[PDB]
Write a protein that binds this ligand. Structure first.
Ligand code: K5D
Ligand code: K5D
Lengths: 161, 153
């Protein structure tokens, strides 16, 4: 975990974080960070291997105002699973439909709240065959993921700022 | 953890947190939150001599909380000035020899700490005690922070 601290740059650090989450069973990973009182999601510090087509479309669609994981991160420190039950509006249902077309079907989102008021997320998708296999998997690794998201926040807030 | 969230009042919430920390091997805990909300069984005299001696600005855990989200294990390694050693010797007198502080930074900007002491006979044994529960502790601190900020403010 503390390799994340050691890393020189965003580049090597980004490569460690992706090895680490891949090692755990995840396929697509997003680390995002904003400084305190900023809603400029379209311009956050972003690391990982999320499909760039999804990220650009998400930007243009204004999906930061729709993504249920985003309003959740601004109010909570606790994980949110990409369960069908977090997609509660016609817009969020449609947001899920497009995220699926990009392979972001099963996963979770750990909110990040740093010591300097930084706000962000560690999102990780898993490539599973049904909600039951996805959820059992994510609960196994949840306690390692719970430590990892804060090491990422601390070393990651360090490189960005 | 879920029962922490099911808690209707601050009193049953602290009872839960105290029992969980106790079941995990800690005997004295402080949960402090600023927007200060204080729960736990810390020696009431210690919280008092703390403020009195203005120890907030010599105690290494406090400076670390303002700057990190990672836990800091209590140790005279950071208590290396002579007052910082009196601070430890005094904390030792109150039973707070071994333990760790989890910093708390909530979604709406709350600032705080979850401190947990362990009774142990040496630093090796103490760190084993805390390392072995660290993943569970890491979840506890965030569950406590979310549910505790929602019931403190
Ligand atoms: O506990 C703490 C940290 O407390 C904080 C920090 C920041 C905001 C608020 Br609110 C509370 N420090 C000492 C470690 C040790 C022997 C003793 C004392 O517990
Ligand atoms: O992962 C995320 C974004 O998280 C955040 C939150 C707050 C601040 C910042 Br900066 C980033 N959203 C979706 C999860 C899922 C199926 C899809 C989407 O991509």
């Amino acid at each position: 975990f503390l390799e994340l601290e050691r890393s020189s740059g965003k580049l090597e650090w980004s490569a460690i974080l992706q090895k680490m989450a891949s090692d755990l069973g995840f396929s697509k990973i997003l680390f995002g960070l904003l400084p305190k009182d900023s809603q400029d999601y379209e311009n956050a510090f972003i690391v990982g291997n999320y499909p760039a087509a999804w990220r650009e479309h998400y930007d243009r669609a204004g999906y930061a105002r729709v993504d249920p994981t985003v309003s959740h991160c601004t109010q909570s420190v606790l994980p949110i699973f990409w369960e069908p039950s977090i997609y509660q509006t016609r817009k969020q249902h449609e947001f899920f439909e497009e995220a699926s077309a990009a392979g972001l079907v099963y996963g979770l989102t750990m909110p990040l709240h740093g010591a300097r008021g930084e706000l962000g997320a560690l999102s990780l998708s898993v490539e599973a065959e049904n909600r039951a296999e996805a959820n059992r998997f994510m609960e196994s690794v949840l306690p390692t993921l719970w430590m990892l998201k804060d090491y990422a926040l601390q070393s990651g807030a360090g490189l960005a700022f």
